[PDB]
RNA sequence: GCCCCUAACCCGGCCAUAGGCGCCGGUGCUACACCCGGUCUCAUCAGAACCCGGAAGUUAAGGCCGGCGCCGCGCUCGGGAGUACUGGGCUCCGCGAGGGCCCGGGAAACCGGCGUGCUGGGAGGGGGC
């Protein structure tokens, strides 16, 4: 059950649906050392180097200025995504609300604290952290909207829909969708 | 080499008749793609992108072509209209602000109709010198 064989194939070879990428985010308020603990958690949780996310504006009521890092997110692809996604689903219990699916084939669910994930330990040093896990599904041909030269729009029939997203999570990932 | 003809590709000019939304078809030897990988050059949180090496799969998408509808847009077309406005003249009217006549120019909105990219160079392909 690896990334290359996790594919929902319909009656056309090029209309297959796969996990394009999985993005894990942690929104911490201000601190660097507080961020540093969250940055260390993501590196050891996912095995991938997380990137600091800087504030887009200066919000006085949150005590954040534009340009300082207030976020740590890492995007996961191919096999690191599938491996971590399986753990994340277990921490929730193979349950995802139906309303959590968007019309364009994105699924995001939250993790209130990271201990429910298998393979992690309650540590009084890192503390307790929440997580946002977003999964993107894509049919082949998404490069048409992302390449540098001759960028254009992908046809409507080649885009992942909400119904194809729920089916992928149920039929391929074996997840209870409610 | 040379001349002529000629799809999709490359470099352009004008920059919507070229744009936008929806629907229905065509195209795949080659060309364009989607596509397959990340040893090497290069790259990032991330081989997603960029870059490199390829050729199993596919015309589902992009590109290009044809048709229909609506919006937007365009037109040296009809009306609007010789209307609005206006250069020159006046012992012409009006209490007056202003109007009128003669000679010379002359719109716009809008309504209807038509249109919905045109074109330069090159590669490739065909024919001859």
Q: Are A16 and A22 in contact (CB under 8 A)?
A: no
Q: Are A158 and A39 in contact (CB under 8 A)?
A: no
Q: Measuring CA to CA, which residue among A11, A113, A110, A27 is closest to residue A64?
A: A27
Annotate A141-155 with three-state secondary structure: CHHHHCCCCCCCCCC
Footprint of strand B on the protein (CB under 7 A): A 4, 12-15, 21, 48-51, 73-75, 77-78, 139-144, 146-150, 152-158
| Nucleotides on strand B lying under 7 Å from protein C-beta | 10, 21-23, 33-37, 44-51, 57-58, 60-63
Cα-trace Rg, chain A: 18
Q: Measuring CA to CA, which residue among A21, A40, A67 is closest to residue A123?
A: A40
- Give the CA dihedral A24, A25, A26, A28, nearest 10 degrees: 160
In units of Å, what resolution does this entry have?
2.0
Beta bridge partners of A8: A17
Distances in whole angstroms, Cα of residue A1 to Cα of each of A20, A22, A128, A162: 16, 17, 31, 23
Checking each nucleotide's C1' against the CA of A154, the nearest proves to be B61
Q: What technique determined this structure?
A: cryo-EM
User: Can you spell out the DSSP letters for A87-132?
Assistant: HHHHHHTSEE-GGGB-TTSEEEEEESSGGGSTT----TTT----EE
């Amino acid at each position: 059950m690896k990334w290359k064989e996790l594919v929902l194939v319909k009656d056309h070879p090029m209309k297959r649906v796969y996990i394009e990428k999985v993005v894990v985010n942690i929104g911490v308020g201000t601190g660097g050392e507080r961020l540093e603990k969250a940055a260390n958690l993501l590196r050891e949780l996912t095995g991938a180097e997380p990137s600091l996310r800087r504030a887009k504006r200066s919000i006085k009521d949150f005590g954040i200025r534009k340009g300082e890092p207030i976020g740590v997110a890492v995007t996961l692809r191919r096999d690191k995504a599938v491996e971590f996604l399986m753990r994340a689903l277990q921490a929730v219990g193979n349950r995802i609300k139906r309303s959590s699916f968007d019309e364009r084939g994105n699924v995001c669910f939250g993790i209130k604290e990271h201990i429910m994930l298998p393979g992690v330990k309650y540590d009084p040093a890192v503390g307790i952290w929440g997580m946002d896990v977003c999964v993107r599904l894509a049919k082949p041909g998404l490069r048409v909207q992302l390449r540098r030269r001759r960028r254009s729009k992908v046809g409507k029939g080649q885009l992942v829909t909400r119904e194809e997203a729920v089916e992928f999570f149920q039929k391929v990932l074996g997840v209870q969708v409610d």
